[PDB]
Amino acid sequence: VNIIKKRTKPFKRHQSDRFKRVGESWRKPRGIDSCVRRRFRGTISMPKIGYGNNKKTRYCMPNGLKAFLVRNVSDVELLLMHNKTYAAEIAGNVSARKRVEIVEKARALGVKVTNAGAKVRSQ
Amino acid sequence: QDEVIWQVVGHEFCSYRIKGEAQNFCRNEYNVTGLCNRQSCPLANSRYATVREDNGKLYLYMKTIERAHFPSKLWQRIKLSKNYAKALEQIDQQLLYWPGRQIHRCKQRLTRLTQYLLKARRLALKHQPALIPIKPKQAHREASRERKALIAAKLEKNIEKELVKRLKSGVYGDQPLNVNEEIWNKVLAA
Amino acid sequence: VRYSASPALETKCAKARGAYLRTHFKNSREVAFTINGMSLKKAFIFLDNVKEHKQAVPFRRFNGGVGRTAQGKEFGVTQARWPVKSVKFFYDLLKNAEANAEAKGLDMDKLIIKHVQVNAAPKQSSPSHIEIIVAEEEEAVPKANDT
Amino acid sequence: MKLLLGDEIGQLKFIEIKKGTDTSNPESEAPVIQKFGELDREKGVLFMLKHEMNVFVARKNGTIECWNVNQEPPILSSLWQLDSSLLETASIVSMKYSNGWLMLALSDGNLLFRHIESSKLRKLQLHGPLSAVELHPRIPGIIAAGGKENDVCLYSCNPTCKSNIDELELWRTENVVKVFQGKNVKNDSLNLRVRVWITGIVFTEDIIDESLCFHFATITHYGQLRFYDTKHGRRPVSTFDVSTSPLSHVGLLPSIKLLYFADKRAQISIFDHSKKKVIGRFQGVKGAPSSIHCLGNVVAITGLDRNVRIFDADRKPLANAYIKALPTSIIVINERDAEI
Amino acid sequence: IKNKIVRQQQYMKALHQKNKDKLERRKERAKEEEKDPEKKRLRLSENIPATIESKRVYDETIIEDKPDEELQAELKDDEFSAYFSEERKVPKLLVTTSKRASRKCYDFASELLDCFPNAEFRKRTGDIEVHEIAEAAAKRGYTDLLVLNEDRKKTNALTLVHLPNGPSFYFTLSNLQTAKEISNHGRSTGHIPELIINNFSTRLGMTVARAFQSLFIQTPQIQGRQVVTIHCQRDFLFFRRHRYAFREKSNMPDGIGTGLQELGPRFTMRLRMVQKGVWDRKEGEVFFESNAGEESDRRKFWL
Amino acid sequence: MKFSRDVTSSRRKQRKAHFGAPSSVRRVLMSAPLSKELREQYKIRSLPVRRDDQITVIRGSNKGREGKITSVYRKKFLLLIERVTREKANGASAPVGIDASKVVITKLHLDKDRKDLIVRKGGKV
RNA sequence: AAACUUUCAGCAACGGAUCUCUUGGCUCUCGCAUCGAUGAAGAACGCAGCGAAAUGCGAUACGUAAUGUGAAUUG
RNA sequence: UUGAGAAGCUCAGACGAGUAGGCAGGCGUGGAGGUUUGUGACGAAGCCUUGGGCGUGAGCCUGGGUCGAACAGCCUCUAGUGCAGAUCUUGGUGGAAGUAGC
RNA sequence: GUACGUGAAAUUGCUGAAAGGGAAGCAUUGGAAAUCAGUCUUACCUGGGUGAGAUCAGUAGUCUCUCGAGACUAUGCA
């Protein structure tokens, strides 16, 4: 099944572009005076359950394999029977040596490691 | 003694569970599918059968109720033959009259363990680059000592210091072609 | 010291700087953005005319109540003035701008002012930081004929 | 310490280095040399076997000879010459002496056995390509073969001997028979053939037919030092991954009753044969060692960093010099220092 | 002092005395030197500023300019002889690349080929290895063989081998700049460029530097007045290709000092590994390996 | 674990009584391990450090440099050994502080006090 | 068009948040009973080799005696 | 036919603004017990980013740079646990302006 | 570099690229410039011949478990 997104532009809290105190993460407005709350046309949209994505092609990367944080060499082993539905995303704090051994074994399991190239310059 | 050990470990806390976001995974070494399902967890399911390699040759591990209280002797073992059609015919003759769900798993984890050895052997025989680690302490030292050693050579100045010395010594014919007509006479004056 | 300019190579360039200079910040800037991009020895003949009221420096950005002069039209700017304290400080710097190539052994008669910077300072007034870049004009060799 | 040297351009460097001499240190004394020999590339040195005091330095053009170092400076005692046909296709990979005999084995199985003083030579033919051969030092007249895809096999002139044999009987082509041929280890952990490339053979029987159960250990280009036996069978009795760079030199340290090895990357490290593990490494070397000779409580490592160290049984660096050229083999003459 | 306010007032007053008597040391020195410029001399002959090049570690393999025979007996008969002897072999370069290289690795692989005539470009396709390339490239009249080895769309390393058995060198490119990025660049021409190589005091310095003489044509055209530099300085091999024009400059004592205009590229190498023999990263014998822990001393140099 | 209500396990109390101990406590906190040749002839695991001992340095960047202790600096918790001297820019030499726990004692400066400590504390002369 | 303003990015400034610590606080618990006309608590002044919002001390003054440890102090 | 986390799986219809209010499921922060044969000087936390990824969203995962000693996921316990606003408290910095003015 | 661990935001100056006819700000759909990612690198699968052996031997032994189940050491590699 080809992956699809009902929306691609994230939601952006109202007037979080003008003021630097107001952050961009979404916060539903609380006043009935609001133009946005009454949903006047022309104002920005809102997070609703309508924009929920397909319950089967959810959590999937655009390739089709879902992600999976592998933080050591025995976390990629579980992905042995799931190499065509999961991509072994290595965690960020893993050292640049313990990383180069996950790659050499995930490659045997045919698992896509998404960022195997970090800290690893090849010769 | 089975739903007891699934309503404890399957729903409250099990040390092997991994909270994924679309699934949950089991870190047990005797799981046949990798997931923490009811019909998959090796702790609740008290008659089980898994396939897992050990140093080149794939094995089959089986347990029963009547050995459950003996954790050392709990799992027996059968070594699976190299011929892939022989191994399927050897799983069945050992796993007879077991449910069709369980024997389905073992044959699927035989297809999945053979593809791992048939790949990691070809992968080991190819010649592939060396993943060598970068090191922040020794790439911030280079960048530090580079610009301290780049400006400490007067790179452009030492080029021209000998470039005229290469001219003034006369490695080119007396009147060369890379020089204009006037300043060569200064070299004649030199 | 780590400077703000990509130029000022070891090859044909030299730098000086001046920190915590007890002058105004909105007054040395308009001087600084006038002397910028000019040759070195001309800037000396330029600024001494400011010291004798022979030339005024335009006030482009911080043009608060600056009366019009007759000589501000040499650059097209309406308003200009003759600050004397700020240009006294720049002369001190540009001496070090010379005397650093005089120790590096450059060519002095192809020397332009490449990058002059004026910043603020930790308030005690409105003090200033200044760093200057003087560089040779990066000449061009004629191309060899054909191939 | 008295120790003789010879580089790839033929000349002989004769060193009087002593303890505490670090040529990198300005506050150390300078090396004392008496250099001679041919300065051309064609007479370049390959090996320096040590006859009891006479060095027998061979050359790439086949000018194997006899150098006595008792005289100061050494003067050539005698000289041999080999035919150019054995230089055309073959190349010299070994030279070892035991009981008045001198091999000059080549890279195709040609075994030129030359006598020392009687000068009666015997040539032999063997199996595929060679990379190392060796003589049993205790029992006279036992050879070990070895090369790439030519696993170790024990051709022996006299299989019995029982103490010793008269010299002129030795190494007749009629009596040399293989009394041992190696059998490979099993397949790898992925069912792949363990490819065999023997690079050096040393006889370990000191530190572990009358006098059977021959014991020896060999190294491989693929990086796996393997011990051997005959009473136990034709498989190696032990296999270790002592390193991963191709192992270049193996030998004994007879004062520790222990066996060392080396490689291309200079992981020259002693190896416990009793506890089956590497115990210590010779530190400070940065570059491929070309040859290593050991004598008593000292060793000498000459490397492609153009240096000659003096380590000991306890791998403590004694002396460290520079030699102005690319060396090829080192021989130790005097264990004592310069003042003795 | 555990206080912070006291600690930077006690130091402000301590510095303002150390910043005072230094002037009091130099003010009294200021009056006697213009009476007697001879004491000015001694000091100047005494207190020359000390710099890293003058405070090196004493390495005994610094070859002096005095010609000793054992040097020239070696390197007149090595494998670099054909590019140094009377034969004067024009070296034909082969520049391959790392497998599955990208676009940003290929626009740099045209800038080096601007530097090198008698140099082809052959992009590495599919499954082939460097040791099999060298033997397959020597049979078609090639001399050396460069390999640009990018990673993640930046070029980081460069290895050149010497055929068919010569020493193989593994540098790493750093501080990479193209020809477009440099301010006041120039066009290159078809003229074969000229060479300069500086500060290779070590013996290993005169092993790499000959393998850098080995890539350039042994007698260049002078009409282009193009110069290529390999300047070792603190074990970094600076590469700068310039085009010069001689013009009068009064400061330097001869009066005639040229003016350079860079062409590109602008890269800078370290030296990591050197292997006699074709470069196999695992099946090779190491002539020199870079110790990343014995280069901590900024006064220790190996090039 | 510790089973006394008259010893303290808090980092606060232990790390204060260390850094603010007087210069008699600051002596037995600066002790050095004896060499393996002295550990069997005095039967003492460790001695407090005196001046003019005969030590070797095991850890640190000054590995293996032997000497004698010049000035046992009880304040900043470090020994000061002979001729192991980091340079200074001006031209003078500076002393390098080697921790008193890193050195290995090879020859004691035996006195009447030390002997009367040696002969009772598990050993003899 | 340049300038000026605005916007983006890089760099330099400003500024001291975040993170990490912690000879400090706060809280609970346990043992103990001990100031003064034989001059207390407090105050002033002095005393250091070089001391300056601090410490110790009393003209025997950054303390003596007695015991114990055992060779330092430090800029 | 294996789709038994029966707290799962599966089939079919209708429905979808929402104030006071009512109900439910989750996200995040500091500490506590258990757990990950957990991550870390080959660089933990933080920070910045014209990089990529997920979730409807609160949020999370990650590449690059910076940096230098600690830190996180899961199940529970616990609260000094979430800010745009209070002529809000403290600190820092702007436009007014080099104007008012001495 | 004592204006000293990390060094956020406001805010200031320079440089680069843009935009600006008495309003910007944001949302939606796309153009132009810049730039980024995608495994596509290669892998896959199918006969004969040659060699290697092991779970093969009309084969001999050891140990731990439970007749045989694994781990082995030989020897052949039918």
PDB file of C-alpha atoms in Angstrom, chain F residues 33-83:
ATOM      1  CA  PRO F  33      52.211   1.972  47.986  1.00  0.00           C
ATOM      2  CA  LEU F  34      55.454   0.163  48.594  1.00  0.00           C
ATOM      3  CA  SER F  35      57.274  -1.710  45.867  1.00  0.00           C
ATOM      4  CA  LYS F  36      56.902  -5.464  45.563  1.00  0.00           C
ATOM      5  CA  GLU F  37      60.482  -5.886  46.825  1.00  0.00           C
ATOM      6  CA  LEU F  38      59.799  -3.869  49.988  1.00  0.00           C
ATOM      7  CA  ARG F  39      56.297  -5.251  50.578  1.00  0.00           C
ATOM      8  CA  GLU F  40      57.840  -8.614  51.547  1.00  0.00           C
ATOM      9  CA  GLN F  41      60.759  -7.401  53.696  1.00  0.00           C
ATOM     10  CA  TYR F  42      58.783  -4.898  55.785  1.00  0.00           C
ATOM     11  CA  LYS F  43      55.403  -6.705  55.543  1.00  0.00           C
ATOM     12  CA  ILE F  44      53.737  -3.287  55.205  1.00  0.00           C
ATOM     13  CA  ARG F  45      51.170  -2.582  52.505  1.00  0.00           C
ATOM     14  CA  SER F  46      51.720   1.180  52.568  1.00  0.00           C
ATOM     15  CA  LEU F  47      53.725   3.932  54.310  1.00  0.00           C
ATOM     16  CA  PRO F  48      52.863   7.593  54.788  1.00  0.00           C
ATOM     17  CA  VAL F  49      55.086   9.712  52.588  1.00  0.00           C
ATOM     18  CA  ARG F  50      58.173  11.406  54.025  1.00  0.00           C
ATOM     19  CA  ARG F  51      60.558  13.819  52.391  1.00  0.00           C
ATOM     20  CA  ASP F  52      63.635  12.368  50.669  1.00  0.00           C
ATOM     21  CA  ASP F  53      62.092   9.001  49.867  1.00  0.00           C
ATOM     22  CA  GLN F  54      63.093   7.001  46.772  1.00  0.00           C
ATOM     23  CA  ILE F  55      60.058   6.601  44.537  1.00  0.00           C
ATOM     24  CA  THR F  56      59.031   5.669  41.014  1.00  0.00           C
ATOM     25  CA  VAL F  57      55.975   7.070  39.231  1.00  0.00           C
ATOM     26  CA  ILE F  58      53.555   4.477  37.845  1.00  0.00           C
ATOM     27  CA  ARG F  59      50.591   6.445  36.505  1.00  0.00           C
ATOM     28  CA  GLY F  60      50.244   9.809  34.797  1.00  0.00           C
ATOM     29  CA  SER F  61      52.141  11.236  31.864  1.00  0.00           C
ATOM     30  CA  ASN F  62      55.412  11.108  33.833  1.00  0.00           C
ATOM     31  CA  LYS F  63      55.448   7.334  33.720  1.00  0.00           C
ATOM     32  CA  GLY F  64      58.447   5.520  35.153  1.00  0.00           C
ATOM     33  CA  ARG F  65      60.560   8.577  35.974  1.00  0.00           C
ATOM     34  CA  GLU F  66      62.468   7.795  39.168  1.00  0.00           C
ATOM     35  CA  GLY F  67      63.716  10.329  41.681  1.00  0.00           C
ATOM     36  CA  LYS F  68      63.646  11.528  45.258  1.00  0.00           C
ATOM     37  CA  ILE F  69      60.949  13.683  46.807  1.00  0.00           C
ATOM     38  CA  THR F  70      62.049  17.297  47.172  1.00  0.00           C
ATOM     39  CA  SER F  71      59.155  19.040  48.940  1.00  0.00           C
ATOM     40  CA  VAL F  72      56.145  17.075  50.173  1.00  0.00           C
ATOM     41  CA  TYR F  73      53.499  19.722  49.551  1.00  0.00           C
ATOM     42  CA  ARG F  74      50.832  18.843  52.098  1.00  0.00           C
ATOM     43  CA  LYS F  75      48.510  21.703  51.148  1.00  0.00           C
ATOM     44  CA  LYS F  76      47.684  20.863  47.517  1.00  0.00           C
ATOM     45  CA  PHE F  77      47.967  17.122  48.119  1.00  0.00           C
ATOM     46  CA  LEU F  78      50.932  16.382  45.861  1.00  0.00           C
ATOM     47  CA  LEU F  79      54.566  15.352  46.038  1.00  0.00           C
ATOM     48  CA  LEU F  80      57.363  17.190  44.236  1.00  0.00           C
ATOM     49  CA  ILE F  81      60.091  14.987  42.791  1.00  0.00           C
ATOM     50  CA  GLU F  82      63.608  15.767  41.589  1.00  0.00           C
ATOM     51  CA  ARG F  83      64.245  16.832  37.987  1.00  0.00           C
TER      52      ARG F  83
END
